[PDB]
């Protein structure tokens, strides 16, 4: 069972660095929040 | 007019008749004999119910307490009667009784 | 038995508009987008958008 878990746990699709993959999502989130406050306190 | 109660009567929302000949004497006895009634519901509905009760059968010292709401299909009234008579006029043991219902909010469970 | 009904309704309308004001404050408080104190990466970008935008 640990051998099958070892063959499954280290897939090429998993168990790696998604930190950049969600860091880019975080960056575009901050940028759309930036433009959101742009369009907000243009008139706030 | 001396026995205390805080009985709560619901009031549905018919077309233009605003009460029931099924239920008119029972809901006028309380407003005639009460001392402080309150009204919960829609704004103009509790206004016209205060107008209707004062113009039909109430008296000039009830001190209608109105607290309006928004999302309330219907309008609920609570009629209370403080004793305020100076002879003796004491409350019987705050009715810890399994036979009778306590005379603040009745919660009437009966068919037989 | 006597009509005698005026003047005791503006107080009630004031009560209705006060409950309306409370509902409006609850609706305004239901927000996820406006001011809520965040980390420095959010807040410096926020303050910069305010400043560059007042100049704009």
Author numbering:
A (entry chain C): 225 to 268
B (entry chain C): 57 to 168
C (entry chain B): 169 to 224
Question: What's the publication's text?
Answer:
Here we report the use of single particle cryo-EM to determine the structure of a transmembrane Cag T4SS complex extracted and purified from H. pylori. The structure can be divided into three major regions: the OMCC, a periplasmic ring complex (PRC), and a central stalk. The OMCC has a structural organization markedly different from that of T4SS OMCCs in other species, and there is an unexpected symmetry mismatch between the 14-fold-symmetric OMCC and a contiguous 17-fold-symmetric PRC.
Adjacent to CagX, we traced a continuous chain 243 residues long corresponding to CagT. A predicted lipidation site within the N-terminal tail of CagT was not observed in the cryo-EM map, but the N-terminus of CagT is positioned for this interaction with the outer membrane. Using symmetry, focused refinement, and symmetry expansion, we determined a 3.7 Å resolution map of the OMCC and a 3.5 Å map of the PRC.
